[PDB]
Every structure is written in C-alpha cells, then in structure tokens.
C-alpha cells in the first residue's frame, strides 16, 4: 500500500492503515528530510504494530505495484486502485480518472460526513450508532441527507456537520485524525469486503445528469457496483443542485 | 455471569462468552463429571481465554450474577406440550434458585420454546421485565442469506425477523419471503441431521451478552411482553426489537407495519397463546 503526501492527513492516514493491520508494505511518498524523520518514527513502534515493511522516499519507483495508492503513480502501479483524499475531493476525483486512463479511482466522498452524521443522530435516539443507519450523499455544505433511510430537524443535525469541519478548520487548520480515520476505506477495499460506502465516483446518466458520492460496492477490485438509487423528487433535485 | 445447564448449549454460550472477554467470572450448572470435565476442559485452554471459571451444583455459587443465560432444555422423542410443560417444571426449580441468590440478575433465556419459557421465567421470578429477555429472533442469518443474494456485506443489509421463535415468525419487509422459510425449515432441519442447535446459538447467546454486558444500548429482536401491541391482549412475549444495555431492556419498540404485517404478528401472537 502507498500513500503520497505526509502532511498531518497522510499520517493519519497512514497511522490509521498501520493499526487496522491492512498492509505487507507502506509506503510514504519531494522533502526529503522530513519523510525519512516520520518512517522512523513509525518503523521506531513496529513492536506494536504488524508491519514490518515501512520505507518513505522521494522516488514515485517505490511505489511499484502498490495496490492501494492513497492520495493526499500509474507508471509505477498500472494496476492499483486510486483513492483520493485531496479536499476538493469530487472534481479531483474527476481529474485523476482522466489522467490515469484507469477504469479504479475512488474519493473518500462523504464516507466520513455519513460516519458522524449517523453517530450523531443515534446519540439524539439513544441508539449503538452501528444500529441506526443513513447517509449522506452529494458533494463533501452541499451534503445530501437521505431521510428516506421533520424535515427542519434533521436539516439541523446535518447543518451540524457542515459547520463542523468548517470550525475545524478555524481552530486546527485541517483535518488530520476524522479522515485518517475514514480512511475504513482501505479495509474495506483490501479485504475485499464488498460493503457499500458513500464514495465519490461518475454519476453522469444518475439524476438526469449530463456532465459525486453515491453508494457504492468496495472490494480488491474497487467499486464493483454502483447503485442508482430511485430516492425522492427533492433530494434528487438537490443531487442535480448538489452537482452545480 | 451464570450459565445453567452444561450440555452443549450452554457449553457453546459458555465459550461464546469466555471468547469476547465479556465474564470476569463464569459459574456453570447435574451431572457433575461433566461440570468439572467441562470446567477443566475450558481451565486447561485459559492462557487462550481471559479467566476464572468454576462449576457446580450448589446454586449458591451463583451469588450476585449480573446476568444469568438459562439453556436447560429437554429432547424430543418419539411421540409437543408436554415437553413444553416438563421445561416448565424445570424452570419451577430453575428460577427460584436463580433468583434465591441473585435477585438484581439479568435472566437470558435460551431453552425453548422461548418466548413461552421467557414468559414463565418472569412469572416465576417475579422480576421487572427489563431483566427477563429471550434470545427470541436474534434476523442474524435472514440477513446473511439475503446479504449473499446481493453480493454485499452483510452489515450493510438491515431486515430482522419478529415474533415467534418459530414458524409464526413474520419477516418484516418494510425495513425475500422465501429466505424466510428457507431459515425456519434450517433451524428445524438442523434439530434433526443434528439432534440440537448449538453453535449458531452460541454466537447468538454471545451477540446479547455483549450488548448488555458493555451497555452498548444496542438493539435486538427479543423476547418480552407485547400485550397492547398488534392487537395483542394476552401477556405473550414475542421478539420485537429492544434495546440492550446493562440494565437489560431499557426500552421496547412500537413499530409501524404494513397491514398484512401486522395481521401476521396477531397471527404468530395467537399460534403461541394456544399452547400457553
């Protein structure tokens, strides 16, 4: 598995990967100085870990075969699955897929905005969030709850998770840990899992679309099935809104 | 955490619970060659296991379970109610001795039927009802079966299955029909290649224990009083979807079927209520 751009994401990341146990190799991709300071760090708690190969470096040659590529290459891997993490995740997602010519191009999507926006309703209900289950579709403020899986409350909860990153970022600067963590992803896809995550893909022909993060099918191949789901005229009219 | 009854039931429970570190202290309860074989058998494998087991006879041992998971049973022979009827005279000496020593227990029913036997546990034990569950339909297989169909992970599909542990049981497809049959006819079907169930149970027994033991608050299609429910009036437990936490169920849930739904769990209420 690689992961290029060891900012406080591609540690995280990269830290959150490394105690799921999901990779043989990591592999953190132009400072030198400061990659070879983090892959001693990590390589300095193997002990704790089940890792035994962890190598950074400024030569994409070391990313060969590296079937997960996390991204915050084809050359070196024309077989891996791309899985994009770069803020604007939707229209990168877009650009990659166009310049790798790959089938195999995943973006994080609203996987994590879904992941507390759920936690945060069954902590309302009084529920184990793992038994209530929604989601959010759309782009990672433009998100998309999906009520049908009143309407100014749960608007609310979701407006939660809109200024939420947001004030993040004002107080942090970025988010580092709530993606790393996110990216759940890697397991799924390398496990071969086939559950179903919302992910930023082409939804061109969905939504009456003609030029974003659906539910989709993750395993060692990817996304090897997308839904195209018949949901309600207004959260569909907000799809077509979401995309402008 | 009490099991009773150390035939294989409860012995799959019992290292159901030993596997997910939810007992700190395990009892287990006639035969005693087998209580001690059994115990030492699990002793003999503890570096594998976290803990302290002890066996016996003497329900004293029992002493301030938090919950209690009650598996004795009887077979079947050649020649219905009245097996329904000899559980029963055992849960008369079951559950007062449970109860003798550990009155703010939390009782788990396992031996069946369920949902009758989690009925006459709570009449016996006088206990409040949150602290008297059945394994009831804890749904697990209907949506592994259905999750298969379509090729997904099972914990992204979300269907259960409500009132009879039985085959009164409604699948709820508001929230197909055949794979409902299809694990009705295998529980029944298992009984007989096999003379039991017992480790599907045991994974089931595990489910529960956890929920409750960790206060997870998690929700479960299990066995409680459904009496102003569907139409219901006479106090029949059936598997609805509660709500576990340490202090057993903490609150019910009141669903909202489609017609024919709802007609069926009256249907599956009334096929339990002719025999109690």
Same mark, same amino acid.
């Given at each position: 598995?690689?992961?290029?751009?060891?900012?406080?994401?591609?540690?995280?990341?990269? &830290?959150? @990967?490394?105690?799921?146990?999901?990779?043989?190799?990591?592999?953190?991709?132009?400072?030198?100085?400061?990659?070879?300071?983090?892959?001693?760090?990590?390589?300095?708690?193997?002990? &704790?870990?089940?890792?035994?190969?962890?190598?950074?470096?400024?030569?994409?040659?070391?990313?060969?075969?590296?079937?997960?590529?996390?991204?915050?290459?084809?050359?070196?891997?024309?077989?891996?699955?791309?899985?994009?993490? $770069?803020?604007?995740?939707?229209?990168?997602?877009?650009?990659?897929?166009?310049?790798?010519? &790959?089938?195999?191009?995943?973006?994080?999507?609203?996987?994590?905005?879904?992941?507390?926006?759920?936690?945060?309703? $069954?902590?309302?209900?009084?529920?184990?969030?793992?038994?209530?289950?929604?989601?959010?579709?759309?782009?990672?403020?433009?998100?998309?709850?999906?009520?049908?899986?009143?309407?100014?409350?749960?608007?609310?909860? /979701?407006?939660?998770?809109?200024?939420?990153?947001?004030?993040?970022?004002?107080?942090?600067?970025?988010? $580092?840990?709530?993606?790393?963590?996110?990216?759940?992803?890697?397991?799924?896809?390398?496990?071969?899992?086939?559950?179903? /995550?919302?992910?930023?893909?082409?939804?061109?022909?969905? &939504?009456?679309?003609?030029?974003?993060?659906?539910?989709?099918?993750?395993?060692?191949?990817? @996304?090897?099935?997308?839904?195209?789901?018949?949901?309600?005229?207004?959260?569909?009219?907000?799809?077509?809104?979401?995309?402008?």
């Amino acid at each position: 598995i690689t992961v290029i751009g060891v900012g406080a994401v591609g540690m995280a990341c990269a &830290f959150s @990967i490394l105690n799921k146990e999901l990779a043989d190799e990591l592999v953190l991709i132009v400072v030198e100085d400061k990659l070879k300071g983090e892959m001693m760090d990590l390589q300095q708690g193997s002990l &704790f870990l089940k890792t035994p190969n962890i190598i950074a470096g400024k030569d994409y040659e070391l990313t060969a075969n590296s079937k997960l590529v996390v991204v915050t290459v084809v050359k070196y891997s024309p077989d891996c699955i791309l899985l994009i993490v $770069s803020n604007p995740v939707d229209i990168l997602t877009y650009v990659a897929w166009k310049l790798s010519g &790959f089938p195999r191009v995943i973006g994080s999507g609203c996987n994590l905005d879904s992941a507390r926006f759920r936690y945060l309703v $069954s902590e309302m209900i009084g529920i184990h969030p793992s038994n209530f289950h929604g989601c959010i579709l759309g782009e990672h403020d433009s998100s998309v709850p999906i009520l049908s899986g009143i309407k100014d409350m749960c608007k609310d909860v /979701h407006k939660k998770v809109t200024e939420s990153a947001y004030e993040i970022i004002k107080l942090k600067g970025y988010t $580092s840990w709530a993606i790393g963590l996110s990216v759940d992803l890697s397991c799924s896809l390398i496990k071969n899992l086939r559950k179903v /995550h919302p992910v930023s893909t082409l939804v061109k022909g969905q &939504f009456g679309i003609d030029n974003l993060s659906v539910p989709c099918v993750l395993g060692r191949n990817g @996304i090897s099935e997308v839904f195209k789901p018949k949901l309600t005229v207004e959260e569909e009219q907000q799809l077509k809104n979401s995309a402008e």
